[PDB]
């Protein structure tokens, strides 16, 4: 497994972040049932539909995530 900072690439298909990366803020709190909480710079800032400070941290399934950042402490 990776680390907390080890920027993984979101390869879902059914997502607004398809072909994008983010920061894996997982292996701190997401020692549970779904493994990987990642960062998103595009959380859809349309304030009267969703919000401007909504879902930046979201939990994935690793099958749809490949490693990019050598963030080993």
From Swiss-Prot:
It is a peripheral membrane protein. It is found in: Cellular thylakoid membrane. Pfam families: PSI_PsaE (PF02427). It comes from the Bacteria. Keywords: Membrane, Photosynthesis, Photosystem I, Thylakoid. One of its GO terms (cellular component) is photosystem I reaction center. The keyword Aminoacyl-tRNA synthetase does not apply. Its main location: membrane. The keyword Chloroplast does not apply. One of its GO terms (biological process) is photosynthesis. Stabilizes the interaction between PsaC and the PSI core, assists the docking of the ferredoxin to PSI and interacts with ferredoxin-NADP oxidoreductase. Belongs to the PsaE family. This is Photosystem I reaction center subunit IV. The gene is psaE.
